[PDB]
Structure formats: C-alpha cells, structure tokens
Amino acid sequence: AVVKCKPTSPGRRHVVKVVNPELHKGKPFAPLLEKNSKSGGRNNNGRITTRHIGGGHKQAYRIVDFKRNKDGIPAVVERLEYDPNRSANIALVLYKDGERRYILAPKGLKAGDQIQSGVDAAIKPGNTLPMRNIPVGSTVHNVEMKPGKGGQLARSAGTYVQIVARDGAYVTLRLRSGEMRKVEADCRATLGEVGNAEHMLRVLGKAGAARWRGVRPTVRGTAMNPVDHPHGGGEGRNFGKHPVTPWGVQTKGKKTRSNKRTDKFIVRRRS
Amino acid sequence: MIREERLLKVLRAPHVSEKASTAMEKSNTIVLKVAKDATKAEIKAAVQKLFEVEVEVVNTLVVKGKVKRHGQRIGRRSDWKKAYVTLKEGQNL
Amino acid sequence: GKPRPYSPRPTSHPRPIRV
Amino acid sequence: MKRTFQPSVLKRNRSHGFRARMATKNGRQVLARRRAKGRARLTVSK
RNA sequence: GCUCGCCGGAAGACCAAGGGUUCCUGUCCAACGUUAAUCGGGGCAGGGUGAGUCGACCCCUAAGGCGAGGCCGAAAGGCGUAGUCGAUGGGAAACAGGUUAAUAUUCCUGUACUUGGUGUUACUGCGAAGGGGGGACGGAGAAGGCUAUGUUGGCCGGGCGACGGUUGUCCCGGUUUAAGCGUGUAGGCUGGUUUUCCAGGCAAAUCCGGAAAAUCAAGGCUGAGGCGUGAUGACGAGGCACUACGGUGCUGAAGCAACAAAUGCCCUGCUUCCAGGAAAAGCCUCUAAGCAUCAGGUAACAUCAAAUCGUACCCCAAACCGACACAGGUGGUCAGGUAGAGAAUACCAAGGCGCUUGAGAGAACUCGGGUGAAGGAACUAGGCAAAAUGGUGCCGUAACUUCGGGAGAAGGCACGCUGAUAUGUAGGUGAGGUCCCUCGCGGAUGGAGCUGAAAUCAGUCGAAGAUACCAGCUGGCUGCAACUGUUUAUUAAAAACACAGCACUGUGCAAACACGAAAGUGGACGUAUACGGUGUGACGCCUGCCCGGUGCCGGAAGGUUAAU
RNA sequence: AGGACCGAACCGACUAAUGUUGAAAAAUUAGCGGAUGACUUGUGGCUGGGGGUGAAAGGCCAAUCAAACCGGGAGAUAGCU
Ligand SMILES: *[C@H]1O[C@H](CO)[C@H](O)[C@H](O)[C@H]1NC(C)=O
Ligand SMILES: [Mg+2]
Ligand SMILES: [Mg+2]
Ligand SMILES: [Mg+2]
Ligand SMILES: [Mg+2]
Ligand SMILES: [Mg+2]
Ligand SMILES: [Mg+2]
Ligand SMILES: [Mg+2]
Ligand SMILES: [Mg+2]
Ligand SMILES: [Mg+2]
Ligand SMILES: [Mg+2]
Ligand SMILES: [Mg+2]
Ligand SMILES: [Mg+2]
Ligand SMILES: [Mg+2]
Ligand SMILES: [Mg+2]
Ligand SMILES: [Mg+2]
Ligand SMILES: [Mg+2]
Ligand SMILES: [Mg+2]
Ligand SMILES: [Mg+2]
Ligand SMILES: [Mg+2]
Ligand SMILES: [Mg+2]
Ligand SMILES: [Mg+2]
Ligand SMILES: [Mg+2]
Ligand SMILES: [Mg+2]
Ligand SMILES: [Mg+2]
Ligand SMILES: [Mg+2]
Ligand SMILES: [Mg+2]
Ligand SMILES: [Mg+2]
Ligand SMILES: [Mg+2]
Ligand SMILES: [Mg+2]
Ligand SMILES: [Mg+2]
Ligand SMILES: [Mg+2]
Ligand SMILES: [Mg+2]
Ligand SMILES: [Mg+2]
Ligand SMILES: [Mg+2]
Ligand SMILES: [Mg+2]
Ligand SMILES: [Mg+2]
Ligand SMILES: [Mg+2]
Ligand SMILES: [Mg+2]
Ligand SMILES: [Mg+2]
Ligand SMILES: [Mg+2]
Ligand SMILES: [Mg+2]
Ligand SMILES: [Mg+2]
Ligand SMILES: [Mg+2]
Ligand SMILES: [Mg+2]
Ligand SMILES: [Mg+2]
Ligand SMILES: [Mg+2]
Ligand SMILES: [Mg+2]
Ligand SMILES: [Mg+2]
Ligand SMILES: [Mg+2]
Ligand SMILES: [Mg+2]
Ligand SMILES: [Mg+2]
Ligand SMILES: [Mg+2]
Ligand SMILES: [Mg+2]
C-alpha cells in the first residue's frame, strides 16, 4: 500500500512510503546471510571511481537463487522478506527435501503458493522454465543471458520481459528499456512480473532519506571552479559550454555504447 | 630438571633495604637481585639448591634503570629483576 | 648575528589599500 | 586548540618504524641514507 | 595551628592515550621557579612497582595490510589465490578486610573460583581441516520488577551547652559487611515426548532441515533482586594505655526497620518502525577416514602446573598536545545533601584548592561592573551596545494556511507564610492478624505504620511571594532561499553549496562510467521501478516562439580525401 | 511518529567588547545556533601532489596550498635592485 505521511514536521510533508503488511517482521534466515561491507564507491586503488556513494544503513547480503537449478522438486513459499540489497521483495521457499532458498518475489506470489523449476514445470508465476518451454507472448523475469549463468535481465521492482518471437535456437525479448534482444532458447526465465511494483511511487521526502540509502550529495559542475570541472567558473551564474561529464565527454545525447561483440544479439535499440 | 650451571647464574645478590628487612621479619620473605632472563621456576630451584631452604612461592618484578647525569653527559643505569622469595614457616637464611 | 626569522604570524590590522 | 602532533606509538611505529621502512625498496633507501650519514637513531623504533 | 575565602557533573576521585621516575625518603638552593624561598615536578643520593584470576601476550576474526604459487607490467614494480597478519569487537577464573614513607583485586588474613597436564578408580563409541547449532548483534519507545543510593524513625554511644531558653517532639556521631556457595523469585521465550520415512546440509550422520503418525498437555530454557550461608568472623562511634606529638599498642556498643529511588540491573528482553541492523573462534552437537577388549570419551578423588611482560607517578593536566610551571586542546568511568523538571542553577558534603611577586595610594585615562533627576533612539550607517522580556497553572489567542501549523501568537488573572477542610486529605506504599493452600520467595482479605501532592475557605507579613541564581522581548509590512542541513580551520554563514521533487540524456551487463601502460577493481554480488552524467531545485499554477549558428542524433545521390 | 519543539552535556561559531610585543601564531567574556541526527565522538584503516579529498569556499591535504613537504638538477635564469 502507498500511504502519504501527515505534514507534522517539514521533513515528513512530502514523504510517501510503501507499507507492505505481508512482509516478515522477524529476522531473516541466517544460513543464507553473508556480510557485505560498504565501498564508498572506492576501488582497490582506494580512489573514488563512482561518486556519490558512502554511509547509509549497515546491510547483510541475502544469498538469492537467480539460477533456479533445483528442478523437479516442488517448493512452497514460507514468507515474503524485505531485502535491503535490491528494490524487489524476496520469498523464503522450502523445497520438499528440506532445503530452504531465497528467490525474487514475483507479483501475486504469497505464502502457501507452490513453485517448481525445470522442463516439465507448470506455466504459472514463480515457476522457472527454459525459455523454449515457455509460450511466445508470455511475461517473464529473472531471464538468463547464457544457459546456466543465472538471471541477469528484469530483477528490479515491477520489471518483466515479453517473449515476442522464437526463431531456431534463439528467442527475441522486449526488455523494459524497450530493447529487442536475442537470447539462447535454453536460457531459463521465471514466469510473471517481479513484485513490489509500487516501489517507484515512494517519495523519499527529505535529504536524510537519500543519505540512509547510501547516496551522498551531487555537486553541480556549474557550482565549481574551472580547475574542478569543465562547467566550472563565471562571475554569477554563467555556462556557455556544451554540457559534458567531469571528464569532458558530452552528456546530453552522445551514445557511449562501444561493444561490437554483443551487437549481433541486439535486434532493435530503445531510441 | 635444570642444570646446576644455570642455577649458579640466576642469583646475583641479596637486596638490602627497609622493605626487604621488614619482609624478612614479617612475611618470612627474602628479597634477591636475580638475572633479568631468570624465571620464577629457576629462582625457586636455585634458592632451594644453593641456600638449602624450602621455598613457598617466588614473586618477581623488573626494576627500570634511572636516567642519571654525570658531568652534563646523560646516562642510563641497567634494568634488573627483583625476586620476593617467600620461605616456609621455619627455615631462616 | 640575527636569529632565524619567524614564519607569518597573525596581524592586528589590515594594510591600508590605496587604489 | 588541537595541534597537529597527536601522539600514538602504534601509528608512529606502523608509519615510520623499522619494519615499515624495510618493507619497501624506497624505505630501505631511507635506512641506507641514514646509515651513510651515520645517524645514531635510524628510525623512530627506538 | 586557628580563622577566612574558592571549586564541588569539579578546580573531587579512578583510568585509557601520551609521558617516563615526574612517585617516596634524606639532603642541597648556584642555575631552573617570571619575586624571596628554609619550599619544589629543580640539583644530588638512596629507596619504591610483588598477580593462575587485572591488563598485555595468547585463541578468534573486522576494515585493511602482507601475500607461496598465480595473473599483469620496459626495470622498479602492480593486483591477487591458498594462506598469514591486523582491535577499536568475540573468547576461562577473586572477593572483602588488613598492611608500606612509597605497591596492592598483585603482599598478609579469611573465604573462593578457572583451565589444562599426570595418576588412580568406575563406566563407556571415540575420532575432522568436514556438516549443523550457538556465538550473533539496528533505531526509537513504553512499562513493570528491582538494586546502587538517599531520607526519616528505631537502636546504641556521647552531650546538657561562652548569651535568654535547652532532661525533650532536644543536640552530635555511628548504625558497615564482599566474591563464592545454596535456593530459584518478578519477569521473558518456547508446546513437550516417542516412533517411522526422506531428491536437502560437496561424503556420512544417531545432529540439523523436511514429512507422516501416536500420546500427553505441562515439560524445558532463560532470569534481576530477595532470602540463607559466607560471618561465634571482619569492620565499627568512642574509651582505656604509650606518644620520638609524626603516629603505634589495646579493647569494643548498636549494627534494625520503614519510605523514596536512578540515566545502573532484569533487558542481547518487550512493543514498534524502516533506513532492515559484523565476522570468526571458544562452546555444544554430528558423523567421515581411521582406531577396535587399544587409544580416546564421561564422572569422582588425588596430585602437579598456570610461564613471560606491564603494575611507581601525572592523566581536563605544572608531568600529555600547545617553544613556557602557557586562561587553549584531550576519550572513558564514578555521580552525596538542600532547593530544582534537571547532569541547569545557587549554597554545601566527601575531597581538593586560594591560581609562585608583594606592600601602599585611592589622580587623569583604560578595562570589568553597580546606580541615576527630567527626557526616552533625539544616538548611530544601523537601537551597535545596553536596558528589557523571562517560571507554573488557568483563561484567552489575529491575518494567513500546504489544515500540521501560525502559537508560548497577542493579551488578562493567580502565586509567600499560617490554620482549617484532613491532630496529614486524594494518591502511593504496605506490617501484624485472619482465612484458603497444588504448602511457597504463594493467593485473597486486612488497612498498623510510613510517605504524600493538588485544591478550597479563613487568617497573616512585606514596597515587592516566579522575590536570589535561573528564566522567551513582542507585534506589523516586505526582498531572497521552500524547509533541517553544508561552507571560505585563521576578517565572508549568506541570497552561496546541498536538498527531496522534476527533466533531459547515456547505459542490455564482460553496462555506461571511473581508477589503472596492464592484470584487475569500483559501478554491483546491483540488472532499466537499475546505474552514471547533466541541468533545475519542496509545493501550487505553469514553462510560449525560434533548429539559421555551435553541439548532438540520423541519413547518403554525388564531390573531395590517408596509409596502401 | 519526527533531518519535531524548549534546553544542559556534546558539537558549533551570529554579534559585541577585550586582547593585538596577547594568557592564546585565532583566544577570553557576555550573549548566540544545532542538540535522535544529512548528529556527535574514541580506536584503527584507506585515498598522495597536476595527485588526493571537497553538501564546492580554489576549501582542506601536519601553524605551508591557483599545485604540499624534503632532497636533488642547482651556483636555474635575473637586459633588474
Ligand atoms: C593582518 O594582515 C594580513 C595580511 O598580512 C591579513 O590581511 C589579515 O586579515 C590581517 N588581520 C587583521 C585583523 O587585519
Ligand atoms: Mg551520482
Ligand atoms: Mg540530484
Ligand atoms: Mg564558487
Ligand atoms: Mg577546464
Ligand atoms: Mg551575469
Ligand atoms: Mg551570454
Ligand atoms: Mg602470591
Ligand atoms: Mg609481575
Ligand atoms: Mg652584524
Ligand atoms: Mg630527575
Ligand atoms: Mg614529590
Ligand atoms: Mg629566584
Ligand atoms: Mg626532585
Ligand atoms: Mg581481509
Ligand atoms: Mg610471488
Ligand atoms: Mg597483494
Ligand atoms: Mg590471527
Ligand atoms: Mg581490543
Ligand atoms: Mg599511590
Ligand atoms: Mg536499598
Ligand atoms: Mg540518556
Ligand atoms: Mg597506581
Ligand atoms: Mg593549562
Ligand atoms: Mg603559575
Ligand atoms: Mg571533551
Ligand atoms: Mg553547575
Ligand atoms: Mg578606581
Ligand atoms: Mg568604570
Ligand atoms: Mg544598570
Ligand atoms: Mg535616567
Ligand atoms: Mg526616572
Ligand atoms: Mg516611552
Ligand atoms: Mg535618528
Ligand atoms: Mg544625528
Ligand atoms: Mg543587541
Ligand atoms: Mg542585559
Ligand atoms: Mg526591494
Ligand atoms: Mg536556506
Ligand atoms: Mg539552519
Ligand atoms: Mg573565515
Ligand atoms: Mg564568521
Ligand atoms: Mg566488473
Ligand atoms: Mg539553482
Ligand atoms: Mg530537532
Ligand atoms: Mg566549521
Ligand atoms: Mg561563549
Ligand atoms: Mg531547534
Ligand atoms: Mg535546543
Ligand atoms: Mg573565486
Ligand atoms: Mg594548514
Ligand atoms: Mg606548477
Ligand atoms: Mg643546470
Ligand atoms: Mg642564484
């Protein structure tokens, strides 16, 4: 549910929060927890390589099953859990052989519902089939790009992929970007849409809320001195330059894709 | 078992002071200057073998040497180890 | 002789600006 | 006011100590220069 | 030595860090000490730091470091795997009393506890670098039960007052006791137990996970405090004996209760929220290879071991960082009384100090304060500074508004003390006794004692009752920025920066992008509801016309055009 | 509940006076802002000089910053004093 906060303080007036009451209020499943210490957008040289990363809430990593290899064995969803590592909610599922795993929580999937992966899996949300066993026109998520590698396409809140055409050993996929891309027919997808579609309706409301999620302030180029950024300088607000990145590359329409290796798999771009 | 050669090199001197005198007449304890590398066990072996008395427990501390001046030339005395050696009820040294 | 001079220290008054 | 020298023996030894110098060729060249000059104290270690 | 003054959430006490003998004693006063100095953190000499339990070392990991091979790089080197280091975190155990000129959870006395080795005896499935459990974790809020601790009464010892009164509802002091061991309480969590099977837990598993019966519903885990013991002891106000007037020897009363009560404990709990809250070992359990009346395991008893290094002293400071015995800086711990909401503030206690030049004088002028006739912003760039406002309860409260606000708007009234209501009320607390009882640290009834607001009525003192300290000035019009934030360490705090929100644009994942000759790494263990870049800057209403120029994106008939 | 309100500790630094061979190479005194957060603080770690880091002031990077410090090229060069 999308609920608007009352304007009791100025920092709460604009806050819009996604209150999902079907989420596990208790602690997560310990066996599938790892530590992931923060980077601050700094690489192994200790240099900031991605700006605007730092601080925010301590987060444990949930080992999410993106592969869905455990096929032929039925699985029941125990509970939907909050995952701080991603926009999607995750489902704790118990297979009939005792093993528990986390999966991306698809739209509609609740506790009690049964999921199953493999070639002979049923065509319902949660179930993960090889995409040659999925009908054309179907809506799928957690789509593999190489057979066995695990889902890389359409993992974020309310995202999904349409199987538009099957040709030989390949299928054509309309991605959320609007891109028509070919993938190997063998590549596994999970049917449905990734849940928590109300994720984009949230309004952080105040500066601090961004600082909680680990985003540090963006300082505009035009607010700087010439030495710092091409947009730097001027007496008062000046510009008179073609908008560029901090490193001089034009930033208002200039295509930066340079991958002739994967061009063959692109049927049509977003444009 | 420790060699007599080693047991003859760990006791340097009896330590003479009011606290040593008081300890010897109050808590039947002898205060010894010992080798800086000597252990409580080696002190408890050496006193028993060289003074023919029965030792209850050895307590040790390291005395840090003082920084002294001799003709406006700075110098430092050596660190030494002090052993508080508690004898039994009736032994005497 | 003369001692090594001091690095800059706080100044009580601004130099007058003549322009 | 807080001044620039805030002593910590651990930081001192890790930053400037004998083993820190020995760890790199440039650090070993420091020791070589200081021995060549005939310093009584090669490093902060003492 | 007496008095006076000052601090007392410190200017007291205990530490870490840092320093390193500054500690204690004797002796000296050249220099050092902003003066003198007989004194000193100064000179000189001697002394002083005692640990199985405190800390380090040690076992274990975090960030991060190093890194066999390895990948990469003109060389130097870079990165990183297995590993191995790395606390600021996890991991066994000691308390009270006494003692030194100077150490003490370290010495002594009393009473404890922990871990491992060895031996004996009984009984026995033991075994890991592997599996599972556990360790193991957030913010906020709330309430109950408690203790530290305080107050008062009782009790005991002493007192009868330099000046009116003071044998009483009088005055002063004391009224302390630990770990451990036993008990298992307020509270918190969870349904036990048995059998059978199993695509899971790199193999196995009696363990964990899952499934299916059956029976019983009360079993287990956790837990402050209290109580008992520890303790016929220790401590103990004072008094009897020696005083080398520093301090030794000797004996020893009461040692209870009630009430109040933490920010400490139960509580790593409970409730709730979104921003979703280390790791690894010790520990517990499971088996594998292997070992089979052996090794090894469990329990009791006995014996042995627990090394090494730190331990003085300062530590909001004259000993650390500031060249100084420098009005600065410096993390943690302890937290008495009266008033008070309080760790504010005032005055005190314990304890510690009077800040290492003094003596006079009582000019101008400077500094820091107090008061001021009449006037009241006339001052001035500007009410700068100052003056003023200031508490609690009740009443009352505008435009405007995003309906929260604005608001403590503004403004008005009351306030001390005494008595009564009521020899102390409402409320809180709760003994004895009675009754029940699965019989105890229980339940119900019971209101002795204790504590105790607030209000009303009446009276009464002062110029003034919020009396001190403490403690909003208020209102109106308007620019800018929505807001809380951030900034020029050291002349700028703002209208600047950021900001949620908005838009454009890039980016299909070996992403764009960034750091890097490279390997790699960040982006992200993320995947277009995502990520980068850019501009704009909450919200509301909106965001028009122009694609010639310069970018960018796309097209391609020809023209020209590189190496070759 | 809250980047909510009043207000100590704590963090800061708006105004004034003092001080300016200072008590102090940035303070003191009286007022002042924040004070559950985009908070503050201890310990340790990482980022290195055309480089870092920067809620952006050319700020900060050991009392040094429109290119740190130290040594070297080095007796740079100086139609200038
Ligand atoms: C002192 O002079 C320096 C220049 O030498 C600066 O201007 C500084 O701001 C001055 N300070 C004062 C108080 O005028
Ligand atoms: Mg960014
Ligand atoms: Mg932005
Ligand atoms: Mg600027
Ligand atoms: Mg430029
Ligand atoms: Mg202009
Ligand atoms: Mg112009
Ligand atoms: Mg002992
Ligand atoms: Mg010792
Ligand atoms: Mg001359
Ligand atoms: Mg000395
Ligand atoms: Mg002294
Ligand atoms: Mg003198
Ligand atoms: Mg001295
Ligand atoms: Mg590591
Ligand atoms: Mg190598
Ligand atoms: Mg390496
Ligand atoms: Mg280690
Ligand atoms: Mg530590
Ligand atoms: Mg002492
Ligand atoms: Mg009590
Ligand atoms: Mg508190
Ligand atoms: Mg001490
Ligand atoms: Mg000082
Ligand atoms: Mg002084
Ligand atoms: Mg402080
Ligand atoms: Mg005070
Ligand atoms: Mg005068
Ligand atoms: Mg005056
Ligand atoms: Mg006045
Ligand atoms: Mg007047
Ligand atoms: Mg008047
Ligand atoms: Mg008037
Ligand atoms: Mg005027
Ligand atoms: Mg005038
Ligand atoms: Mg004023
Ligand atoms: Mg005033
Ligand atoms: Mg105007
Ligand atoms: Mg603003
Ligand atoms: Mg502000
Ligand atoms: Mg400034
Ligand atoms: Mg300023
Ligand atoms: Mg990568
Ligand atoms: Mg702007
Ligand atoms: Mg606030
Ligand atoms: Mg600042
Ligand atoms: Mg002030
Ligand atoms: Mg405020
Ligand atoms: Mg405040
Ligand atoms: Mg400028
Ligand atoms: Mg500087
Ligand atoms: Mg330059
Ligand atoms: Mg030359
Ligand atoms: Mg020259």
Author numbering:
A (entry chain c): 2 to 272
B (entry chain s): 1 to 93
C (entry chain A): 1 to 19
D (entry chain 1): 1 to 46
The authors write:
The proline-rich antimicrobial peptide (PrAMP) drosocin is produced by Drosophila species to combat bacterial infection. Unlike many PrAMPs, drosocin is O-glycosylated at threonine 11, a post-translation modification that enhances its antimicrobial activity. Cryogenic electron microscopy structures of glycosylated drosocin on the ribosome at 2.0–2.8-Å resolution reveal that the peptide interferes with translation termination by binding within the polypeptide exit tunnel and trapping RF1 on the ribosome, reminiscent of that reported for the PrAMP apidaecin. In silico sorting of the data revealed three main populations of ribosomal states—namely, 70S ribosomes with RF1 and P-site tRNA (26%) or with A-site and P-site tRNAs (16%) as well as a population containing only large 50S subunits (30%), which, after refinement, yielded final reconstructions at 2.3 Å, 2.8 Å and 2.0 Å, respectively.
In addition to the termination complex, we observed drosocin bound to two other ribosomal particles—namely, a vacant 50S subunit and an elongating ribosome. This implies that, in the cell, drosocin could potentially interact with the 50S subunit after termination and ribosome recycling, when the 70S ribosomes are split into their component subunits. Similarly, the density for drosocin in the cryo-EM map of the 50S subunit was generally well resolved, except for the N-terminal and C-terminal regions. For the Dro1–RF1–70S and Dro1–50S complexes, the α-d-GalNAc modification linked to Thr11 establishes multiple interactions with U2609 of the 23S rRNA. Indeed, we observed that, on the vacant 50S ribosome, the α-d-GalNAc has also inserted in between the U2609–A752 base pair, causing a shift in U2609 as observed in the termination state. By contrast, the C-terminus of drosocin on the vacant 50S subunit appears flexible and less well resolved, presumably because the interaction with Gln235 of RF1 is absent.
